[PDB]
Structures are given as C-alpha cells and as structure tokens.
Design a protein around this ligand. Structure first.
Ligand SMILES: [Mg+2]
Length: 115
C-alpha cells in the first residue's frame, strides 16, 4: 500500500545516498598497473553492488506506479509520489551512466598498462 511504498523508498534512498557518496570518493585512475588493478577490482565489486540493488529500485518504482494508476490517492499524495519517482529515476540513471563510464576507463587503463 502507500505505507509500505514509503518504507521501501526510504530504504532504497538511504542505500543510494551512500552509493553516490562512495562512488564520488573513488580515487582518480592511477598510472601504476598494480594500483589500477585494485581500483578495477573495487569498481567491479561496486558494479555488482549496484546490480544487486536494481530489483529493490524497480520494486519501489513499480509500487509507486501502481499506486498512481489505481486512483485511490489524493492529488497531494500523487504529487509527492511523482516527484519521488522522478528524482529516484534521475539519480539511478545518473549513477548507472557514471559508473559505466568509470568501468570503461578502468578497463581501458588495465589493458593498456598490461600490454
Ligand atoms: Mg486523486
């Protein structure tokens, strides 16, 4: 219902706020092959973390969609939810893109530094 959607959302946003912060405080790509390997490894682990939380993110977005389409909510409640989902989707997609670009650069670095 609305209550269980709000609780799922809070949990997802708490996780995501820390995932964004963790991603932001990664060191810039090193020139040493052994350091780039550790950074490649750390980022691969983070990419699986992101992966594992995808279904919780989809769940909250699905729950919010159902609640809005079912027509049982107040105009204010539908306002709040639309705003919540909009913001969540924006941040989730932004983190997806950024982390994928990070992975590409680390991948290209590791290969170049090994050849
Ligand atoms: Mg209404």
């Amino acid at each position: 219902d609305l209550d269980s959607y709000q609780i799922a959302l809070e949990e997802v946003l708490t996780w995501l706020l820390s995932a964004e912060d963790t991603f932001q405080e990664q060191d810039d790509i090193s020139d040493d092959v052994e350091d780039v390997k550790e950074q490649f490894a750390t980022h691969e682990t983070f990419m699986m973390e992101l992966s594992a939380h995808q279904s919780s993110v989809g769940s909250v977005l699905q729950a919010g969609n159902q609640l809005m389409t079912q027509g049982t909510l107040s105009d204010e409640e539908e306002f709040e939810i639309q705003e919540q989902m909009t913001l969540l989707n924006a941040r989730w997609e932004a983190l997806r893109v950024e982390s994928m670009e990070r992975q590409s650069r680390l991948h290209d670095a590791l290969m170049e530094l090994q050849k």
